[model samples]
Target: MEVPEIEKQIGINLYSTDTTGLGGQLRQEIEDFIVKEITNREEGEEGKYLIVELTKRDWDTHHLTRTLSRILQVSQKRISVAGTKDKRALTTQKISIFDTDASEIEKIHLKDIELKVLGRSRKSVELGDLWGNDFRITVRNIENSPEETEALLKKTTDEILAQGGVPNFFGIQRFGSVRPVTHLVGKAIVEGNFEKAALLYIAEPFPEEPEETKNARQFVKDTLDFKEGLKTYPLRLGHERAMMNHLIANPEDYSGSFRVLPQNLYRMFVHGYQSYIYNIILCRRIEAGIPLNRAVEGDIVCFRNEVGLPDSSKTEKVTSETVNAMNRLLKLGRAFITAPLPGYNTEFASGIPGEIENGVLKELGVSLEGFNIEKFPEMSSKGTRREVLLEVKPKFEAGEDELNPGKSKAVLEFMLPKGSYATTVLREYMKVNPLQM
Candidate 1:
């Protein structure tokens, strides 16, 4: 039996001798931070809007959004963001202070938290005010010669460009901190609870009380935010009942109570490929210069030629050469960018970080002649995140060929807010990386 070279180069053992790789942690070695308490202080209001920006640690914006809803007592629907950031990296995002007093909004304090006001205006951020997020990513730390580094960087960047983006796999964030949702969905499906599966998504933010602990409190608030719109519907009663039935029977797969799922593998694991899908699409969208959200007021067209999904009517009929190229791109897309969006071709709905910023700068008549995307600063996940500027960094890493004779190690890093996941990139690759290896 031979171990793949890339596996060895990754340094951390891919498999665990203990606990049967509980939760697939040993299988993928990916870590996650769910809705954690955000440290945003209420800054003095600027005219009509209160501005709050995250500092130092790139914490979870999802958590931040939920936290704001609670702290500020604003409706979740009132909040929106241009993009989402990474969990591991440090970043800043902006928030709107609608119809609230500036002084009262400025009195929030938390340990390890920093807050300051950056001027404000009367209008809250609308759809187009966003420039995309800027990223400052560091790839897997490894020591290599300049030659190897060059090849890997060149190959990775080119591959990224050629393929358009990675798969937009839902990160571990989707499955909760321990990812019981995946098992729950799986269990519900297997146990004749199809309706449960459907309603799970429908009634997701569960309407539970906010947890007393900081993280739990934030998550609970997020759930409430998710549940806000559907409070009254003809089928809401039926939908809630369906969701409740499945949960009661299946419950959370945490303590091995559910037999349908590998409940007590005694631990849980996150699928690396699954997690990478979202990020990869995000990058590709950025590369293509697409807006993050669906247009509320502008005309935006998509070029599917890069992703192997060129509508024949949109392009010339496929010649052998074109077909081959399309096939190659599709291969790359599946191998890299496979995250699924509800209505889009693949999961990549938005462009990479800095895309919006680039647009914003271009709007301001900024020169692009000598701009290295790396240096040009872009704003953070606006609206959704407090409008702080994040520095976007694009990077890739691989293992030494000499050490791993057969396989290769590769990674692309986009330092996100504290709760964002790297696996979102894998989704763009088309194939999901199994959490359980």
Candidate 2:
């Protein structure tokens, strides 16, 4: 269940040409950043689910769902969201609840949670229902001089465009920042070691984490006593405590402990490993000097619409004729290439991309078939492809910062398609660690 360092897998940013740095802190103030979900559907009437626009600050979706469930006297299962957003920012997204009174929603008063009923829908919100997110992120406390900051950004943007696009690696936020155990648990699950997965969740400790977390994890590791670990673990560590509490009563039911998590979070643990593997493949492609923007022979490419999102259903393998057509489509902003996300039925790409995918799987000592979890067949993913590059055309603006004296605040406003990360856009311009921005 050992997890490799993320930087080792993804490598340094391709736009590491400038050391001028963003000289700023991210999410320094919750209000500094904002994300709004751009959904594809319009308002509807006469349906079983009441679709509402949910806006919250410093609250994760689960917390909001639990609070709403309690206030509205409804089961949490009745509620659904398009996507989960960052906890430490102003985020607005759509959520739908089954047969909930619109009047009752308006009366409920929760700090930092705002709800606006959009209308009624026949179906509840599901993942990928939205087009993407609109982001207005302000990087605060930038220490660099205004001239240097502006100059560096222009150069970085030019280089990114020149190189076609940025690497679409899953940002660090995909994995836990303080304790990166999600992928470790996933690795164990894929390997059919439920007990090891459960133990890794309870006892794995990262050196740089808080002393309290490290001590609790170490205690669990040293003693293997769920009861004792429960007493030592912080209340904030609800997921960990839930696992420990389950083990206290049923020591052998390790898989049952994982079931305590909501289905979405549980699914993420499995997908996290898939994302990690994809990052490795992408890094290898970059190191081999493969062009991420253009399709090569044997590559699987997807068609793009007027906006720069792939039509997942319309994909074709690149051959001689397709090479020129896709290349023309690429120049005309109509198509993009993709890499496989290994799954129960993932077919590796044919040429260099396929070689990289095969090599990554071999290095991990795993194969596509390994994604099949007998105990949790529901979690077995049908393989898909992700765009190899993220085309970032952010509207950039800069100004003096009020939060920190004499420093600057740079604002980036952009829209990314669903399943893409904004951090990927900022990473190129900021040229800093993902954790930093």
Candidate 3:
């Protein structure tokens, strides 16, 4: 059966391209993709935080944190990491433990998880601490001939460069791929509909999910019976069970039930909704024939440092007097236009960009004021701006595959800025299902 296009569910349109027959078939092995986080810190800094390098297979960052906390008998707050990585890949990144000895980490016998202490730091690892990640990804089982696939990759890369960059839409994983319901929950929270938010999270079904998940969600929708749903839900669906347990006791406390979820996930749901709105506005900006690289009057543009990255802290609104200067900076790759992620403090763009943003909100029947969610105060977000364009020059090489006999593989290595998605760059070249990445 053909799957629905992700463009409809997510807000961005697909880049015009052909597939190399590389993504649909699942790999028989876990070594297909590899990711390693690159921290901004240099060699050997002395401090109170224990910097440990964790290498794990098929483990998400959250699970790793909880496990370490359990082993050390420390609060989860005592452990921290820079960013979350793909759950299914062989991934490595640094984690910081507060005032812990390196001997403590080495003593723990962890399965499929290895830790190496990288000295100490005065501070623990925090989100956005990294320069970016180093990806050694292998796209396996490609049926296309070496000549054909390599040529296709070259053309795609050239086109991406020619266009200045790809659209910086939040990747599919930003919302749930299997379920794709995070944004719906976020929308409910933002609109102050806690009951609807709880219902959507537990019951909304995307046709693409497994039969078990769909059936479980449908049962909850039909009965609204938290007790029965708890029994019927699968063990892997732990978050749902957590909420159900809360609801079974408190019956009418929807917000309280949602609070059972981890704080990061709750923040994600709200941010996911904000991301959804930003995407629609960006797509509209593209559809309206606005240039991604150049700034027009009334637009807000951010300056770049020596390394050619958009500086969030240094931004200015474009006026008639400044538009010429901003465009000059854009030409030098020292400045770029930005769009707001809907929040309490986010300002609307001027003229066409502003119109596009406002038009999207109007169509959705939501407003900036809606972001002031009262019931879930912690979930309330103060929005910021993100670059509408991402310029990436990836390092690419093609080779034979050891995984699938008589097939080829491509190794794409690249570094993205701290918040940019590497998969977003790969999508332009691979043109496959975002879930496949």
Cα RMSD (Å) per model?
17.9, 5.2, 4.7
On a 0 to 100 scale, what is the lDDT of residue 117 in model 3? 89
Give the poorly placed runs of model 3, Cα more than 4 Å off.
1-4, 16-31, 43-129, 189-195, 205-214, 234-267, 304-315, 331-333, 374-382, 399-407
Name the runs in model 2 displaced over 4 angstroms: 1-6, 9-20, 44-129, 189-196, 206-210, 230-270, 303-315, 332-334, 362-383
The pairs that clash in candidate 2 are none
Off by over 4 Å in 1: 1-47, 56-88, 100-110, 116-131, 139-151, 167-437
Better of 2 and 3 by lDDT: 2
**Rank ordering of all candidates by lDDT, starting from the highest:** 2, 3, 1
Task: Give the TM-scores of the predictions, in the order they appear.
Answer: 0.37, 0.75, 0.77
Q: What is the lDDT of residue 402 in candidate 2?
A: 82
Q: How many residue pairs clash per model? A: 90, 0, 2
Instruction: Please tell me which predicted candidate would have the highest TM-score against the true structure.
Output: 3
Cα distance off (Å), candidate 1, residue 414: 5.8
Residue range 1-437, candidate 3, lDDT tens digits: 12227754766664522333244233345666678888887535678888888888888778888988888888999998888887787888888898788888888878888899898988778887788888776666777656666776677666566567677888777788577878878998887888888988877767787887788888888789888888888888888899889888788789887678788677888888888888888878877777787788788988765566776567788987888898898768878889878888887888777888888888988778788778877888888788888877666676667767777677777777777777777776666676564
lDDT of 2 at 105: 86
* Predicted structure 1: lDDT: 0.35
User: Which lDDT tens digits does candidate 1 get at residues 56-104?
Assistant: 2545657766776788698865554444545455555555556555565
